[PDB]
Amino acid sequence: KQYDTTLDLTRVKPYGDTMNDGKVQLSFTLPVPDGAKAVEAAKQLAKKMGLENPMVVYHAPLDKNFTFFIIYGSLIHTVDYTSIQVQELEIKAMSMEETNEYIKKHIGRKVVVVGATTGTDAHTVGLDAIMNMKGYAGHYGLERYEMIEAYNLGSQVPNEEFVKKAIEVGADALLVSQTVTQKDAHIKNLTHLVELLEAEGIRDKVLLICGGPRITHELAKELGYDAGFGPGTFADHVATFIVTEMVKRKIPGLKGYKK
Amino acid sequence: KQYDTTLDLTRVKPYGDTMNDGKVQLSFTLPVPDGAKAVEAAKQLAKKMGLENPMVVYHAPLDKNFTFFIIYGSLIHTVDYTSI
Amino acid sequence: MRESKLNLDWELVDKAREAARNIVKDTQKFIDAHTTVSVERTVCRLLGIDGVNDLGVPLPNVVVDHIKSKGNLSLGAATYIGNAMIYTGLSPQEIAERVAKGELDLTSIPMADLFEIKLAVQDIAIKTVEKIRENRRKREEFLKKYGDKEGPLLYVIVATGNIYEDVVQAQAAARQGADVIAVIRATAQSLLDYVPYGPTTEGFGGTYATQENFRIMRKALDEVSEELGRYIRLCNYASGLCMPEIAAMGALERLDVMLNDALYGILFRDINMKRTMVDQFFSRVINGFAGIIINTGEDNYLTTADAYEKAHTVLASQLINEQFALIAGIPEEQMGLGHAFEMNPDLRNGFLYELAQAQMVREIFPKAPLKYMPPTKYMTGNIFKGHVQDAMFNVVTIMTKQRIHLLGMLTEAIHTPFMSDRALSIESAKYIFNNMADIADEIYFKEGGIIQRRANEVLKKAYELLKEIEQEGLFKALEQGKFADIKRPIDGGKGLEGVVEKDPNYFNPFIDLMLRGDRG
Amino acid sequence: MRESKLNLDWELVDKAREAARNIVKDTQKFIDAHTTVSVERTVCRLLGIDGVNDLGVPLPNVVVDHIKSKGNLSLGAATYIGNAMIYTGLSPQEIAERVAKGELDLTSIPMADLFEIKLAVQDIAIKTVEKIRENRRKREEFLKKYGDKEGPLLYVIVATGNIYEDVVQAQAAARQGADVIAVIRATAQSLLDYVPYGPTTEGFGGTYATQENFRIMRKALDEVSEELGRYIRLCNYASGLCMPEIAAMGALERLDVMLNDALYGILFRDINMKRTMVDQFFSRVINGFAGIIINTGEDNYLTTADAYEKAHTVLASQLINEQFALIAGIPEEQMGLGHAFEMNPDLRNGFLYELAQAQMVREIFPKAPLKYMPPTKYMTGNIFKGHVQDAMFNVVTIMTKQRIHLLGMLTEAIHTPFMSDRALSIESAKYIFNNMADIADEIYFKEGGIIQRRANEVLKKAYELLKEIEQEGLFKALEQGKFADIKRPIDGGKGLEGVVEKDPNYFNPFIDLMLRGDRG
Ligand code: B12
Ligand SMILES: Cc1ncc(COP(=O)(O)O)c(/C=N/CCSC[C@H](N)C(=O)O)c1O
Ligand SMILES: C[C@H]1O[C@@H](n2cnc3c(N)ncnc32)[C@H](O)[C@@H]1O
């Protein structure tokens, strides 16, 4: 065509079938009855979103007052792929033997980890993958690590029980499991745990790790945690981060240092 | 969760599980290799598209230079249904 | 001889059934000689006690706590309630109110002859039994009037946490092709030792199971059934430390289905096994009398263990649950034994294995309204491949005639369903069930093929596991972590302090009424 | 042994096959007595003539137009080319160039003895035939080196319109998992009476079928197949006014698949019936010698007609096409007869009828690389239900063992596929083909059931239609609109002027060389 363009990494926009067409798909419900007014409202909402020249390919009523739409449209906005600052979750993992050697050489003593699915949450499959020595897809857990004493407290653990057990066992790092952001109780529970640790005064003496199927590093750092892990994490990543951070910031730990 | 939960026909916005959550779904392809930078680029594109706290649920490679995304997130914008 | 497509070994099935029967005999030896506090609170609720005191604790809780701390709870709450009825001459609810306010002390009244106490309580027992029976009659009348389906019953869950938005979206789904509506319970209600009071507009992960919520949702679904001309069922969960209480509340509010399994509680909520077994007996007696279909939860085993390696565990658990239900008096027509379409989607010939297992379950339990539930473990963020996996789930449901169909959702791995996700799931299921309406009666299987061999392999493994569990006993087998690969100590968990030993003069009017009224 | 899952009536199938054979014999009586200008142009191309003149008219067109206007084309272009070669001593390309420039006149040269002309032309015909045989050997060597698949072959389409973007998309799709790539042809080229020269950079709705484009696509696919370790087939469309020329160009450029069907052109493009039949005979002869898999377009009947009512039409068309191919010399392993999954999704037991028809087709043609094609008529903007329908289509494909599988897209009714849509379709097809791999060997059908009765019904209706067509004649039946509810007159349509009658001394060496070559 006369005015078609080539790729530009500073102005990347979606790709339906041509380099810079920017075609997008989206679906949503509206609390209005079906009709031509509903279609016009959806089109106006799509135009306000950014999709210039939208086209409603589907619309059907779910109820007497609800309609479900599907829209395809050409976008206007562009993102700059070269200046993106990414997130702070980039990490690479050393092997188990390397972790043991690092702990022996630098710290000189075993690292204690206490993990639990605090709050009312019941799931333990991810935390058992990370902790349990059986491993997950060939990645052995923290319990297997020779120089790591890992405790698995299960689920439905109250925060008070968690902090009390951490103090009793002399924990150097604490792990907390949660679930997707559509669970909104995870934020409140994590904030409550942080407040409890601050009140106890043990916050500075231990690390904090929070993860889950859709936890992210940005949210973890916003809450006050020291890290955040999502899907695809394996025990070697966690062990590497714990050892490296412990040596970098010289966490004293609670081992033989009860409050 | 939202402060407003009663339907107002001057400010109708998408519907998820509650009245005014404004949840939307959208899928697109990007001509950049799959990775963490691609996920951040998709999130930034969605945010400038008008979605708060976009959450990429899927991301896969189609080829060595193309990635396919699925994104969910609330929508800021509202449309007046009465004036149309 | 029984007809089969898998050429099942029926002698082996008979031996597995006998092993499960003997397991249940051994376990019931203990259950007969014990009772829990929840059973006593349920007796109080059935006798007419309800409401809350100033502090917000229900009155059954107050009465049972008073009897336990001040007196001998091994005599049962019925003994003391009836004695107070003879003494003061009031009704059980008035006595509970007086105790709550502090104007009466049940354990200080002189104890009358037990025969007179039984006579005093019998009338109220009969009245409550008759109310439950009339509810059963009304449900049967509704089903007869509107007619009943012949294919699967679509089963959707509403979980917004607000009772009224739950009503709105339940009516919306019922107006769509949904046949059974389940209101998933609020997270951390199984841990409570009391049943809340009144309607709730708040809840994290679900809605609280209260009697007023039951009444509200029953009214809404009755109105929608009148509108649509077909009967919409109501489902709830009788798990937790208050299992018999919720069973009684559902029986009184005319729920049509109820999720009643103790192994789920023990393995996934960490409740004591003795507590849960003793609760489960009474709750299943109530559900059997009330006409409710009890649903078990062997689907949950596969989310922790491996589905191909530990498939026989589901069958063994199903046989044990069948025998428990039979001892409680539940007929096969009310035994909704559950299994799930839960193998790896990257497994070659995985569809043949799931089909073989579903057909074997459909053949061992021919009368049961078997429940089939969607894939959950291997669901990812690809909503489109998820729709495809759900389509294969529906295909297996229609090819092997499963009675109840728990609809899988486009976005299981992401969040609880939207309105649109439920609409899409219902639409896909209706499409597939209409196109293959009569595929079950057409397709047969090669003699000696993959399907027959898989079925016989799973059956043999289940029989061996049942013999092992019979040798040790159910409690020991649970201790060694054979179901769901979860090891649970016998004396651990929550609620062991609620278990008590029956006195030689223990009195519970309702067991005999509910076990002989249904039989004669 | 003729083993059948549908208990077919083999006597009825034999009678239908005999009826199709007789119809094709009657039609062939006419074909053998005529030749078209397109056939002469194909002969000229196979002799070596290629290029364009000063005005852009392809050189074969100029040569054939010259012989037609000035001389007598009934003799055949080969006669004139050979006479010119003897008289002047120049090669065919130089003779054609001189004729275009006007420096030579074919009709002014005295005619020599036919024996010398035949020898001179055969000298080059043998070389061209040997080159085509070399391409066949090369294709077989690639297939042997990489090994061949055992399941269905995924078939995708790329329609950018620019050859290089087509190459990029085809390589990406092959890396994604496609086994066959088809470049949809530019719209309104089937009406064109010449084949462009050189590459094309722009087109509407597709890419032109030119020799240079075939060469470029073949190079790209060869490189990608070497990269991937498996063979990627290349497909293109022959039907049109220049059908034999495109067939020959594909044979020279080593195309693995080719859509070759006269009835499609006759009905859906309004091309004259005699022209299309005469073109089809030679094009199928070339395709059969070259080793190309020829596909037929019975899918198009259902889009303009009703699937349930008009399945016998598809079966009768398939039998007629099979007989036409057999007379053209194409073996059974190269007859990719096509059918589609185009029934109404709202039809109860529709999947059973689709399965019965697919299995009947798989049974009547046990050796053909049958082609199964997606639903297109009953698609909408609901991409999710589109994905579900495609999944059911894949289920049918795997359960009936269809060799080639034209992937459908969830966005069939909206636009031409995106890259992501193709990726999703391939992923779904892979999943379903892996899970149900050995389902064809397992599932049988109930004797006398719905599937068997449906198959027998369709077979008998096809037999009756074939008897009617035998009684009337193929041309009259085409005039009566029996095949797609479209009535095209015998003497109407485009291209009638191009038909010619063979002189008694008509000469064409390629027919003899390619018909006798396969027999050793
Ligand atoms: C298994 C499961 C269950 C099982 C768990 C069994 C057990 N004992 O653990 C049971 C039956 C208990 C269950 C119940 C419920 N569940 Co559930 N369940 C699932 C399921 C199928 C899989 C989740 C899972 O663990 N995945 C497998 C693991 C390996 O992956 P993972 O979490 O990503 O873990 C990896 C990473 O995230 C990371 N990681 C995880 N944790 C941590 C922690 C740290 C510190 C670190 C460093 C890394 C890390 O590393 C891990 C290994 O790579 C999902 C659906 C799905 N397909 O995702 C629903 C799901 C999570 N559950 C859900 C819900 C709502 C519930 C309930 C709470 C509902 C209710 N009844 O009220 C119930 C009750 C449980 C409760 N009281 O909390 C929802 C949550 C959605 C939301 N609201 O945001 C889901 C998504 C299903 C749905 N859509 O409806 N569930
Ligand atoms: C048998 C039985 N009885 C009672 C309850 C109620 O639980 P509770 O109120 O006591 O806490 C349940 C609950 N099952 C929730 C599984 S849903 C997770 C799924 N993988 C998804 O993807 O959604 C149960 O199975
Ligand atoms: C919570 C209710 O729904 C079922 N539940 C919900 N989704 C799934 C799933 N995909 N797999 C297994 N069980 C599930 C439970 O068995 C119970 O009936």
UniProtKB/TrEMBL annotation, chain A:
| Single Gene Ontology MF annotation | metal ion binding
Amino acids binding cob(II)alamin 1: A122, H123, S177
Residues bound to cob(II)alamin 3: S177, G212, P231, T233
Extract the coiled-coil ranges from the record: none
Q: Where does cob(II)alamin 2 bind?
A: T124, S177, T181
Gene3D superfamilies to which the protein is assigned, alphabetical: Cobalamin-binding domain, D-lysine 5,6-aminomutase beta subunit KamE, N-terminal domain
The family database entries (InterPro entries) matched by this protein are listed as: Cobalamin-bd, Cobalamin-bd_sf, KamE_N, KamE_N_sf
Q: Which domain of life is it from?
A: Bacteria
Q: List the protein's name.
A: D-lysine 5,6-aminomutase beta subunit
Biological source species: Caldanaerobacter subterraneus subsp. tengcongensis (strain DSM 15242 / JCM 11007 / NBRC 100824 / MB4)
UniProtKB/TrEMBL annotation, chains C, D:
Top-rank taxon: Bacteria
Q: Where does pyridoxal 5'-phosphate bind?
A: A188, S190, Y237, S239, Y264, R269, N300
Sites binding cob(II)alamin sit at: G205, T376, M379, E412
Where the record annotates domain D-Lysine 5,6-aminomutase alpha subunit, the positions are: 6-513
Protein's organism = Caldanaerobacter subterraneus subsp. tengcongensis (strain DSM 15242 / JCM 11007 / NBRC 100824 / MB4) (Thermoanaerobacter tengcongensis)
Q: Tell me the GO molecular function terms.
A: catalytic activity; cobalamin binding
Q: What's the name of the protein? A: D-lysine 5,6-aminomutase alpha subunit
